[PDB]
Amino acid sequence: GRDQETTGFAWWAGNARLINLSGKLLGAHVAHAGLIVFWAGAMNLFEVSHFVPEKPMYEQGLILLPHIATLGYGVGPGGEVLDTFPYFVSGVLHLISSAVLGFGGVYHSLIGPETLEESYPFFGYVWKDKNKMTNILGYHLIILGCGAWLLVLKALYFGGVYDTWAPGGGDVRIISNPTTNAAIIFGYIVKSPFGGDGWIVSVDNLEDIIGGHIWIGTLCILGGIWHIYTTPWPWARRAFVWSGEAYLSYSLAAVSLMGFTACCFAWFNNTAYPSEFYGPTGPEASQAQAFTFLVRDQRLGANVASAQGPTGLGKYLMRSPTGEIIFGGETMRFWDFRGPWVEPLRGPSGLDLVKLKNDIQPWQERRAAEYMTHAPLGSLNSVGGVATEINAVNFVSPRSWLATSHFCLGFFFFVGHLWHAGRARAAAAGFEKGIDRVDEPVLSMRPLD
Amino acid sequence: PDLEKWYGPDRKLFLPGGLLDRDDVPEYLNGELAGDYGYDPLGLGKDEEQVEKYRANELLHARWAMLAAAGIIIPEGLQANGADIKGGTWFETGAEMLNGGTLNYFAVPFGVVQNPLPLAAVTLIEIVLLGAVEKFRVDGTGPAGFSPGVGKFDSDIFDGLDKLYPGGPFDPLNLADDPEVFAELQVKEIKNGRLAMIAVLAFAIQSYVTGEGPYANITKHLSDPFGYNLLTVLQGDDRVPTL
Amino acid sequence: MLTLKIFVYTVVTFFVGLFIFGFLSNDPSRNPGKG
Amino acid sequence: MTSILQIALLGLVLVSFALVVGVPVVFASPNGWTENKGVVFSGLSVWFLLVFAVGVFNSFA
Amino acid sequence: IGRIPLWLVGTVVGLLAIGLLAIFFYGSYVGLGSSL
Amino acid sequence: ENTSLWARFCEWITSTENRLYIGWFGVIMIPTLLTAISVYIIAFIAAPPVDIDGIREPVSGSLLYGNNIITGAVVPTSNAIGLHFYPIWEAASLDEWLYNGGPYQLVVCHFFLGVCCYMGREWELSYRLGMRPWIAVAYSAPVAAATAVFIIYPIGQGSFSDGMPLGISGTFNFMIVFQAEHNILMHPFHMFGVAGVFGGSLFSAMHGSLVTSSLIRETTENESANAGYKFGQEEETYNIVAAHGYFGRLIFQYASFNNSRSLHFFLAVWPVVCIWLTALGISTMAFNLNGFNFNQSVVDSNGRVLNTWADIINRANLGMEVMHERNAHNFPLDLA
Amino acid sequence: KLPEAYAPFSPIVDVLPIIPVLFILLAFVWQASVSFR
Amino acid sequence: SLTLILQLVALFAVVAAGPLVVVLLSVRGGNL
Amino acid sequence: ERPFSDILTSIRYWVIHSITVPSLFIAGWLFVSTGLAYDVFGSPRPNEYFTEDRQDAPLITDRFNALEQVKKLSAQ
Amino acid sequence: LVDDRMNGDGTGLPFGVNDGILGWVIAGTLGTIWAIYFVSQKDL
Ligand code: CLA
Ligand code: CLA
Ligand code: CLA
Ligand code: CLA
Ligand SMILES: CCCCCCCCCCCCCCCCCC(=O)OC[C@H](CO)OC(=O)CCCCCCCCCCCCCCCCC
Ligand SMILES: CC1=C(/C=C/C(C)=C/C=CC(/C)=C/C=C/C=C(C)/C=C/C=C(C)/C=C/C2=C(C)CCCC2(C)C)C(C)(C)CCC1
Ligand SMILES: CC1=C(/C=C/C(C)=C\C=CC(/C)=C/C=C/C=C(C)/C=C/C=C(C)/C=C/C2=C(C)CCCC2(C)C)C(C)(C)CCC1
Ligand code: OEX
Ligand SMILES: [Cl-]
Ligand SMILES: [Cl-]
């Protein structure tokens, strides 16, 4: 590597020394990709080595095996696991690919060419060559669209994906007739992010999921071809900054938005994150608790539509602000929760009284009781329950872990976007190192501020 | 054009710049033949005369294996898709008409026609045809014939013609008069032929392993990739789950 | 009360449009520095 | 058929350790990559062959 | 007099400190104070 | 040539000649904020009682309904609404819009937009003045704290009623109930936040005492030392070497800041990163990650429970938990 | 659990999560070795 | 236990690999 | 002047600290592993927290006879 | 029904638009701001 005097960047900003070095940039990137696939494979092997079959995966502290099981590998009806060999194969393949990527990144970092422009014109680039940056972006867009279409092919012809909305408690379903209608697909995008709408977190069926994936894959492929065969327009060239730190800041803002959004999926969505693998959500656990105590007091010979609470609002069933029949108590705030075990009990006017009385199911009751016992309430010592609870239960929801970690990473990366966008603007401007001391802009304009 | 990557001292090699510097490339591979990648892990190239004598067999193998790969993958695919082939599988095609049950030839787009020829007659005319063909190849003499390129060529057209690349009667569509396009099409031909030999070897070993044709292999692999591959067919039958 | 929603939507869209097209209005040329 | 798979996997682990220790050493050595070509290529080839051998022997065990 | 490198001394000291802290964190899940 | 209306408006907006810089971030910062202040003053003065818990038990919160300044607070939204969006047009009448806590959502949304565009405007003025732009990066920590306590915690708990009430006694109620729920005192992120504000006070006193102690004598004892400093001067006003030497022989020589740039960077970075950590702690508690749980950890050889200070903290958490929202729980487990 | 053929390799499986932390700490070690130039 | 012993040996071999390569590069020429 | 760059890089320093620091570590280990810490600091062992006469937390409930009463309420 | 409501909660309304007049004023305001920006070009 280089030093402080030859580059002007200190060791704690050493990667800035490889801003203009394309070969070392590529080496750092490939070594980092090797690190990411290494974590994927190593965590997969660790989780399958620490996997217990007679327990649900949300009690065992796993986050990658639920991801693989959602795609429908080694799982059967009801969310039960049938084989861990697909997870083991995925982990081993990721470890080998990580070895390959790490070798490539290390080779380019150490003895790879320093600059690719004078010897490899296809891979050479300067940060102001907007055409070449759009070509690289187009290639990556083709790769992303191919990956989305690969997921689509997996859910269509390659065993399908796990449907938690299947009758009986969910099963590995083959997707038939994906909803490719632009209106319903993009109504998620132009939706409000508040309660009752939830923006794209409230996607409730694999048909819309696969339709949106088909749409995003086709859009990404056409956008990649467009970027390969076009150049940024003059309005975009006037509006944007064309430095490497600027491009990094744009990517940082984007991935911060994705981190916050994925935190919201992990906390609220139970379709792309099935509850049989990730545990119940907050609303799901509260509604499961209310429904379990509902059926308990119904078995104990107590009227459920009547028999109001101490506030006269309803102990078991009452009215939502819109007017639907919802579960009583503080779980009113979770009246928009939709799960596989409430929908058969829900009619046109919300929770039907006759359906809740006679159309009950033992599997629904068992799932609700298990979700009530396993709410996403825990300490960072992995102590189940609220903060007052005794150190006796070793469980914290994977949904809670994913949401906390991803919101943290999204916020740090938003601040990183702030830092890099400001430094990119100041570096393109010319005063990123300070004030010129002979051309102070404040003294060039009049007093009184 | 664009011959600066398949010819000369700076060209595409079988290993990139970091793996293979140009110093340890063998001195008899100077980028004057088509498809020269400097690939010599073992000492078989010897000198220029030896490498061109082996390039003769390489080009013959390439041009034979291209037709071999196409004639393996086409009729099996047609039979699987619904044609009346009765023997589209390549490793059992010969055994069909052993006792006189002669094959059906499918001359698309208007095929399905019986061939009323027994095996002895077919092999006799094949020997007396291709022996004469290979005698014409190794001697460079032809009696007389008509080609779309040169019309009614006499016997004095094969003398002086380039070995392994005889222009004229074998080039009716031409597109080889320009030396630059001729050289890049030469490297195209040798690369396609190398891919074809690799494909034919893959066909043979795949057939030996799984007992079915390559078209059946590719169709079943696209039907179920993880559920049908080399590791699946080498497992024998199912697998005890690790639950 | 629909009129209130229409008015609020108009005001929000007006201010957001000024923001967006002001930043499209060649913002880096408002640089007090060199370049 | 399981013991030979375990032996091949242990050899693969040893070859991987030798690679991750020596490949940065070979690369960052002053004029060491020029002469360590054969040993590094042999190590990588043995690593790939052992990966393929463990993969093909997994189906038989 | 400068025989052993300072970076190697710091690496050894940091390794011992990290391992000792890992020992303390392991002791929170076993023995006394582990609710078991 | 700058004659067209949009060019003139753009030059006026990006003008650094104004008393307060507006900018393209200010064109959102100003109207959203003035909306928030207007409705906040009006609600704090004459807001009718708000049914916060959703149990038809309203909370006054406003001065004209019998609240003083400490007890006065804009009450959060009704629990029946939860995370639903409740603007005035989504209500049939202003009476029920005020009864259900709509002003709280309007203030919270406008305040979040206002602080975000204030941070953007800080960057914009740093850009238009030729300055380094990381003042907004420093200001990202109180913005993170406000977002965590006004939006992120209501998102994690599923109801805007769960946010921090806009007041003082409401703030204390939020903190007390929050301790009951999550045991925030026993959390590392909150511990780093407390260490950050304590160290921020310590370092503010340290830096101010070092600079004010080391000012160069340019006045007498009958006039204020501030009169010794002339604005716009280039001559230094204090002895950096004397201050650094005093600090070095006070605490440690080789562990002292001899460079003012590094010293001021440390002063900037310490409370900012600690407030980042505590805001992220609140946001992780929103998804119920909670603090350290050491209830019944020390056990003797016979298995009897040996109570500790964490067990006394558990007793405090129980006392808060059995009393918070005393009529809003029909069931034991507090999962909402 | 792991497959029966790969059961003895579980102890070397368990160490594999901490390698990226060891990698960033190795970057710090290398920077100490170059005397933080 | 055998599992604990193998875990400790694997952990020590991995955690020493970084210092091993850096010391070997520092004493074997340079370029680090 | 010994600016800590010579003492921490000298084998003369490190030959005597290779025994004194481990000796102190072993002394600290044995001090609590031999019960001497419980002896001198009065900390109760896990098996002696509760006696037969009392099965709850002890209470000092006195000032001028606190020595004798804590001797009576201790684990002998 | 004792009183009149818009009843716009939930349902996934595009930009929260319940009447076409709302989307039309969105389009009109954005279009007139864009038109002013487009006419006032070729400056500085
Ligand atoms: C993929 C995103 C990304 C990328 C590619 C970069 C890239 C770069 N950054 Mg940057 N940054 C990012 C995100 C990113 N950053 C984020 C999210 C933040 C937080 C706000 C920062 C804050 C930041 C600052 C302040 C600076 C850079 C700088 C730099 C440049 C030199 C980096 C270097 O060598 O420092 C060396 C790296 C280190 C010394 C490691 C830091 C130690 C970290 C903080 C330890 C944390 C680990 C901990 C276990 C994680 C858990 C925390 C939490 C997730 C729970 C470089 C081009 C420098 C620059 O501007 O150069 C021009 C610089 O000044 N970055
Ligand atoms: C994601 C982590 C990461 C990655 C991938 C990189 C990558 C890189 N850094 Mg960097 N760095 C990092 C983190 C990282 N850094 C952090 C956190 C800091 C703050 C302390 C720094 C500070 C820093 C500085 C100051 C500099 C770099 C530089 C470099 C570049 C060249 C280094 C070099 O060749 O010198 C030689 C390095 C060595 C000889 C150390 C050998 C260690 C080996 C490679 C470890 C490999 C082990 C692995 C298991 C091998 C497996 C391979 C195969 C068998 C699978 C390189 C592309 C230099 C640069 O900018 O280039 C101009 C430079 O000046 N970095
Ligand atoms: C970010 C990806 C990337 C990019 C842009 C490059 C770019 C480059 N590499 Mg490189 N490389 C990479 C990754 C990458 N590499 C990886 C992962 C490895 C480990 C195997 C290597 C190992 C490597 C070596 C050892 C060398 C190069 C060399 C080169 C340079 C020219 C020769 C060449 O193209 O080699 C061609 C590389 C191959 C033929 C490897 C096969 C790649 C095929 C095409 C895979 C198909 C991609 C497909 C989408 C699968 C991707 C998997 C994905 C899911 C992650 C060039 C600038 C050479 C050099 O440095 O010049 C002196 C050189 O010697 N690379
Ligand atoms: C993540 C992938 C990606 C990335 C990084 C880019 C990046 C870029 N694209 Mg591009 N594009 C992509 C995917 C991508 N595109 C895809 C998938 C398509 C196919 C649909 C296109 C089609 C496309 C076209 C036709 C054009 C670009 C253009 C551009 C350049 C300027 C865009 C701009 O001004 O900023 C952002 C743009 C805006 C802020 C104004 C657009 C208004 C919004 C963003 C459009 C969507 C409205 C909708 C209601 C928003 C709902 C979502 C929202 C609520 C979150 C820029 C470098 C332009 C260009 O310069 O040509 C090369 C151009 O004309 N792209
Ligand atoms: C809810 C309803 C709203 C939904 C809107 C969703 C559809 C549009 C969303 C994606 C639009 C892509 C914006 C890229 C160009 C933005 C910057 C620009 O402008 O680029 C600027 C560039 C400068 O050369 O120009 C150009 O490239 C020309 C690009 C702009 C061309 C579009 C203009 C549409 C015409 C509308 C005008 C109606 C005008 C008069 C209204 C008066 C009402 C009283
Ligand atoms: C798969 C899936 C799906 C689908 C999805 C999609 C399809 C999405 C998308 C989307 C889209 C399509 C989007 C768009 C976008 C854009 C953006 C997000 C942007 C941006 C940016 C910015 C912020 C800008 C700014 C600015 C301005 C405004 C001014 C000037 C300057 C600038 C330019 C910078 C669904 C849900 C169905 C289902 C499930 C799954
Ligand atoms: C350059 C640089 C660097 C580095 C970086 C990186 C990032 C690297 C890497 C790398 C990598 C990324 C690597 C990876 C790897 C992998 C491997 C090496 C592997 C393997 C294999 C094996 C051998 C396995 C085995 C097995 C199986 C198969 C299953 C079961 C289990 C077991 C384990 C047995 C640093 C920062 C230091 C410094 C600066 C510069
Ligand atoms: O609202 Mn406010 O505080 Ca969240 O936990 Mn559940 O809900 Mn109520 O209780 Mn606890
Ligand atoms: Cl409740
Ligand atoms: Cl309360």
mmCIF file of N, CA, C and O and ligand atoms in Angstrom, chain A residues 1-2 11 14-15 17-18 21 24 27-28 31-32 35 99 102-103 106 109-110, chain D residues 19-20 23-24 28, chain G residues 23-24 26-28 30-31 37, chain H residues 25 31-32, ligand 2:
data_model
loop_
_atom_site.group_PDB
_atom_site.id
_atom_site.type_symbol
_atom_site.label_atom_id
_atom_site.label_comp_id
_atom_site.label_asym_id
_atom_site.label_seq_id
_atom_site.Cartn_x
_atom_site.Cartn_y
_atom_site.Cartn_z
ATOM 1 N N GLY A 1 0.799 -1.210 0.000
ATOM 2 C CA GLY A 1 0.000 0.000 0.000
ATOM 3 C C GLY A 1 0.835 1.265 0.000
ATOM 4 O O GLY A 1 2.060 1.208 -0.093
ATOM 5 N N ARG A 2 0.169 2.411 0.102
ATOM 6 C CA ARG A 2 0.829 3.703 0.125
ATOM 7 C C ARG A 2 0.882 4.232 1.557
ATOM 8 O O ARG A 2 0.522 3.541 2.515
ATOM 9 N N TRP A 11 -4.199 6.593 7.982
ATOM 10 C CA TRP A 11 -4.466 5.158 8.030
ATOM 11 C C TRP A 11 -5.924 4.873 8.369
ATOM 12 O O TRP A 11 -6.539 3.973 7.783
ATOM 13 N N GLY A 14 -7.699 4.893 5.248
ATOM 14 C CA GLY A 14 -6.816 4.261 4.279
ATOM 15 C C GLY A 14 -7.494 3.812 3.003
ATOM 16 O O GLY A 14 -6.874 3.823 1.935
ATOM 17 N N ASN A 15 -8.761 3.403 3.086
ATOM 18 C CA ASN A 15 -9.492 3.024 1.883
ATOM 19 C C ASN A 15 -9.680 4.203 0.935
ATOM 20 O O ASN A 15 -9.818 3.994 -0.275
ATOM 21 N N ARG A 17 -7.328 6.076 0.155
ATOM 22 C CA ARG A 17 -6.121 5.960 -0.657
ATOM 23 C C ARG A 17 -6.349 5.126 -1.908
ATOM 24 O O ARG A 17 -5.613 5.281 -2.888
ATOM 25 N N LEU A 18 -7.347 4.243 -1.897
ATOM 26 C CA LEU A 18 -7.703 3.455 -3.065
ATOM 27 C C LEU A 18 -8.981 3.960 -3.735
ATOM 28 O O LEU A 18 -9.693 3.191 -4.389
ATOM 29 N N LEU A 21 -7.460 4.192 -7.332
ATOM 30 C CA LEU A 21 -6.774 2.974 -7.761
ATOM 31 C C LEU A 21 -7.840 1.941 -8.112
ATOM 32 O O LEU A 21 -8.461 1.349 -7.226
ATOM 33 N N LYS A 24 -6.897 -1.882 -7.043
ATOM 34 C CA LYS A 24 -7.031 -2.092 -5.607
ATOM 35 C C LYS A 24 -8.481 -1.944 -5.163
ATOM 36 O O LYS A 24 -8.919 -2.639 -4.240
ATOM 37 N N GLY A 27 -9.964 -5.251 -5.988
ATOM 38 C CA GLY A 27 -9.514 -6.249 -5.031
ATOM 39 C C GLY A 27 -10.224 -6.152 -3.698
ATOM 40 O O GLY A 27 -10.633 -7.167 -3.126
ATOM 41 N N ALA A 28 -10.390 -4.928 -3.193
ATOM 42 C CA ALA A 28 -11.126 -4.726 -1.952
ATOM 43 C C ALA A 28 -12.573 -5.174 -2.097
ATOM 44 O O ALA A 28 -13.123 -5.822 -1.199
ATOM 45 N N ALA A 31 -12.679 -9.110 -2.317
ATOM 46 C CA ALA A 31 -12.402 -9.667 -0.996
ATOM 47 C C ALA A 31 -13.577 -9.448 -0.049
ATOM 48 O O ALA A 31 -13.900 -10.319 0.771
ATOM 49 N N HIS A 32 -14.244 -8.297 -0.159
ATOM 50 C CA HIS A 32 -15.421 -8.040 0.661
ATOM 51 C C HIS A 32 -16.574 -8.964 0.292
ATOM 52 O O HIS A 32 -17.317 -9.423 1.171
ATOM 53 N N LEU A 35 -15.955 -12.083 1.887
ATOM 54 C CA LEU A 35 -16.317 -12.004 3.301
ATOM 55 C C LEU A 35 -17.815 -12.200 3.512
ATOM 56 O O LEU A 35 -18.235 -12.887 4.453
ATOM 57 N N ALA A 99 -14.279 -18.970 -0.620
ATOM 58 C CA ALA A 99 -12.853 -19.231 -0.808
ATOM 59 C C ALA A 99 -12.370 -18.698 -2.150
ATOM 60 O O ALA A 99 -11.317 -18.049 -2.232
ATOM 61 N N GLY A 102 -12.442 -14.855 -2.065
ATOM 62 C CA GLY A 102 -11.381 -14.343 -1.220
ATOM 63 C C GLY A 102 -10.022 -14.443 -1.878
ATOM 64 O O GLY A 102 -9.199 -13.532 -1.752
ATOM 65 N N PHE A 103 -9.769 -15.544 -2.596
ATOM 66 C CA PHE A 103 -8.521 -15.660 -3.344
ATOM 67 C C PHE A 103 -8.413 -14.569 -4.399
ATOM 68 O O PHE A 103 -7.359 -13.939 -4.549
ATOM 69 N N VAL A 106 -7.852 -11.112 -2.634
ATOM 70 C CA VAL A 106 -6.502 -11.026 -2.087
ATOM 71 C C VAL A 106 -5.479 -10.857 -3.205
ATOM 72 O O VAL A 106 -4.538 -10.061 -3.086
ATOM 73 N N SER A 109 -5.718 -7.368 -4.532
ATOM 74 C CA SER A 109 -5.275 -6.423 -3.515
ATOM 75 C C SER A 109 -3.757 -6.395 -3.401
ATOM 76 O O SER A 109 -3.159 -5.322 -3.255
ATOM 77 N N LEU A 110 -3.116 -7.559 -3.475
ATOM 78 C CA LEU A 110 -1.680 -7.635 -3.230
ATOM 79 C C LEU A 110 -0.860 -7.461 -4.508
ATOM 80 O O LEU A 110 -0.063 -6.523 -4.609
ATOM 81 N N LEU D 19 -3.052 -22.887 2.126
ATOM 82 C CA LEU D 19 -3.304 -21.834 1.148
ATOM 83 C C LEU D 19 -3.499 -20.481 1.823
ATOM 84 O O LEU D 19 -2.862 -19.496 1.439
ATOM 85 N N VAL D 20 -4.355 -20.415 2.849
ATOM 86 C CA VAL D 20 -4.631 -19.124 3.477
ATOM 87 C C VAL D 20 -3.431 -18.597 4.251
ATOM 88 O O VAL D 20 -3.357 -17.392 4.516
ATOM 89 N N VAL D 23 -0.475 -18.169 0.581
ATOM 90 C CA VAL D 23 -0.802 -17.339 -0.582
ATOM 91 C C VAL D 23 -0.584 -15.850 -0.319
ATOM 92 O O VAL D 23 0.022 -15.182 -1.174
ATOM 93 N N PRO D 24 -1.037 -15.263 0.805
ATOM 94 C CA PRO D 24 -0.597 -13.885 1.097
ATOM 95 C C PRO D 24 0.904 -13.768 1.298
ATOM 96 O O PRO D 24 1.488 -12.740 0.933
ATOM 97 N N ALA D 28 2.821 -11.237 -1.183
ATOM 98 C CA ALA D 28 3.484 -10.072 -0.612
ATOM 99 C C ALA D 28 4.983 -10.265 -0.422
ATOM 100 O O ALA D 28 5.642 -9.359 0.096
ATOM 101 N N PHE G 23 -10.803 -10.756 10.815
ATOM 102 C CA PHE G 23 -10.266 -10.109 9.619
ATOM 103 C C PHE G 23 -10.079 -8.611 9.821
ATOM 104 O O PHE G 23 -9.049 -8.050 9.427
ATOM 105 N N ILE G 24 -11.069 -7.938 10.411
ATOM 106 C CA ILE G 24 -10.909 -6.505 10.658
ATOM 107 C C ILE G 24 -9.839 -6.268 11.725
ATOM 108 O O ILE G 24 -9.034 -5.325 11.628
ATOM 109 N N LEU G 26 -7.299 -8.206 12.025
ATOM 110 C CA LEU G 26 -6.070 -8.465 11.282
ATOM 111 C C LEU G 26 -5.656 -7.247 10.470
ATOM 112 O O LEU G 26 -4.461 -6.983 10.301
ATOM 113 N N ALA G 27 -6.633 -6.507 9.944
ATOM 114 C CA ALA G 27 -6.328 -5.241 9.284
ATOM 115 C C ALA G 27 -5.694 -4.262 10.264
ATOM 116 O O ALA G 27 -4.730 -3.562 9.923
ATOM 117 N N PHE G 28 -6.212 -4.218 11.494
ATOM 118 C CA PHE G 28 -5.595 -3.378 12.521
ATOM 119 C C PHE G 28 -4.181 -3.852 12.864
ATOM 120 O O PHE G 28 -3.281 -3.030 13.083
ATOM 121 N N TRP G 30 -2.108 -5.430 10.812
ATOM 122 C CA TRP G 30 -1.261 -5.059 9.684
ATOM 123 C C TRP G 30 -0.925 -3.572 9.718
ATOM 124 O O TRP G 30 0.214 -3.175 9.429
ATOM 125 N N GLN G 31 -1.901 -2.734 10.082
ATOM 126 C CA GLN G 31 -1.629 -1.306 10.211
ATOM 127 C C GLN G 31 -0.668 -1.014 11.356
ATOM 128 O O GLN G 31 0.112 -0.058 11.278
ATOM 129 N N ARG G 37 1.528 4.031 8.992
ATOM 130 C CA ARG G 37 1.966 5.040 8.034
ATOM 131 C C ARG G 37 0.796 5.525 7.186
ATOM 132 O O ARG G 37 -0.232 4.856 7.077
ATOM 133 N N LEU H 25 5.622 -12.279 6.919
ATOM 134 C CA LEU H 25 5.875 -11.258 5.911
ATOM 135 C C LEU H 25 6.817 -10.174 6.417
ATOM 136 O O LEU H 25 7.608 -9.635 5.635
ATOM 137 N N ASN H 31 7.236 -5.658 1.864
ATOM 138 C CA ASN H 31 6.084 -5.408 0.993
ATOM 139 C C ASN H 31 4.770 -5.724 1.712
ATOM 140 O O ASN H 31 3.978 -6.569 1.291
ATOM 141 N N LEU H 32 4.556 -5.022 2.819
ATOM 142 C CA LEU H 32 3.312 -5.132 3.567
ATOM 143 C C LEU H 32 2.896 -3.749 4.051
ATOM 144 O O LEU H 32 1.711 -3.434 4.132
HETATM 145 C C1 CLA K 2 -13.282 -5.086 4.257
HETATM 146 C C2 CLA K 2 -11.880 -4.988 4.811
HETATM 147 C C3 CLA K 2 -10.747 -4.445 4.021
HETATM 148 C C4 CLA K 2 -10.315 -4.796 2.770
HETATM 149 C C5 CLA K 2 -10.878 -5.842 1.841
HETATM 150 C C6 CLA K 2 -9.180 -3.944 2.504
HETATM 151 C C7 CLA K 2 -8.400 -3.949 1.331
HETATM 152 C C8 CLA K 2 -7.286 -3.164 0.992
HETATM 153 N N1 CLA K 2 -6.742 -2.206 1.772
HETATM 154 MG MG1 CLA K 2 -7.537 -1.668 3.762
HETATM 155 N N2 CLA K 2 -8.139 -1.175 5.718
HETATM 156 C C9 CLA K 2 -9.194 -1.709 6.322
HETATM 157 C C10 CLA K 2 -9.960 -2.743 5.744
HETATM 158 C C11 CLA K 2 -9.871 -3.384 4.510
HETATM 159 N N3 CLA K 2 -8.951 -3.124 3.571
HETATM 160 C C12 CLA K 2 -9.465 -1.104 7.647
HETATM 161 C C13 CLA K 2 -10.568 -1.460 8.607
HETATM 162 C C14 CLA K 2 -8.484 -0.162 7.793
HETATM 163 C C15 CLA K 2 -8.294 0.753 8.976
HETATM 164 C C16 CLA K 2 -7.262 0.158 9.908
HETATM 165 C C17 CLA K 2 -7.668 -0.207 6.584
HETATM 166 C C18 CLA K 2 -6.626 0.665 6.263
HETATM 167 C C19 CLA K 2 -5.863 0.606 5.073
HETATM 168 C C20 CLA K 2 -4.697 1.421 4.746
HETATM 169 C C21 CLA K 2 -3.925 2.502 5.454
HETATM 170 C C22 CLA K 2 -4.345 0.973 3.478
HETATM 171 C C23 CLA K 2 -5.235 -0.025 3.084
HETATM 172 C C24 CLA K 2 -4.920 -0.513 1.822
HETATM 173 C C25 CLA K 2 -5.689 -1.642 1.167
HETATM 174 C C26 CLA K 2 -5.438 -2.234 -0.201
HETATM 175 C C27 CLA K 2 -4.078 -2.908 -0.376
HETATM 176 C C28 CLA K 2 -3.495 -3.513 0.893
HETATM 177 C C29 CLA K 2 -2.143 -4.073 0.525
HETATM 178 O O1 CLA K 2 -2.007 -4.607 -0.563
HETATM 179 O O2 CLA K 2 -1.138 -3.982 1.372
HETATM 180 C C30 CLA K 2 -0.583 -5.207 1.940
HETATM 181 C C31 CLA K 2 -1.280 -5.935 3.064
HETATM 182 C C32 CLA K 2 -0.763 -7.054 3.590
HETATM 183 C C33 CLA K 2 0.516 -7.651 3.083
HETATM 184 C C34 CLA K 2 -1.441 -7.791 4.719
HETATM 185 C C35 CLA K 2 -1.612 -9.258 4.351
HETATM 186 C C36 CLA K 2 -2.913 -9.803 4.925
HETATM 187 C C37 CLA K 2 -3.492 -10.882 4.022
HETATM 188 C C38 CLA K 2 -3.805 -10.324 2.640
HETATM 189 C C39 CLA K 2 -4.739 -11.468 4.673
HETATM 190 C C40 CLA K 2 -5.352 -12.551 3.795
HETATM 191 C C41 CLA K 2 -5.770 -13.756 4.627
HETATM 192 C C42 CLA K 2 -6.731 -14.640 3.844
HETATM 193 C C43 CLA K 2 -7.295 -15.740 4.732
HETATM 194 C C44 CLA K 2 -6.010 -15.223 2.635
HETATM 195 C C45 CLA K 2 -6.932 -16.131 1.832
HETATM 196 C C46 CLA K 2 -6.599 -16.069 0.347
HETATM 197 C C47 CLA K 2 -6.998 -17.358 -0.363
HETATM 198 C C48 CLA K 2 -6.125 -18.524 0.085
HETATM 199 C C49 CLA K 2 -8.473 -17.669 -0.150
HETATM 200 C C50 CLA K 2 -6.543 -3.301 -0.305
HETATM 201 C C51 CLA K 2 -7.315 -3.469 -1.600
HETATM 202 C C52 CLA K 2 -3.743 0.277 1.289
HETATM 203 C C53 CLA K 2 -4.187 1.091 0.110
HETATM 204 O O3 CLA K 2 -4.999 1.989 0.246
HETATM 205 O O4 CLA K 2 -3.698 0.842 -1.102
HETATM 206 C C54 CLA K 2 -3.054 1.936 -1.752
HETATM 207 C C55 CLA K 2 -3.376 1.186 2.424
HETATM 208 O O5 CLA K 2 -2.610 2.131 2.354
HETATM 209 N N4 CLA K 2 -6.181 -0.260 4.068
#
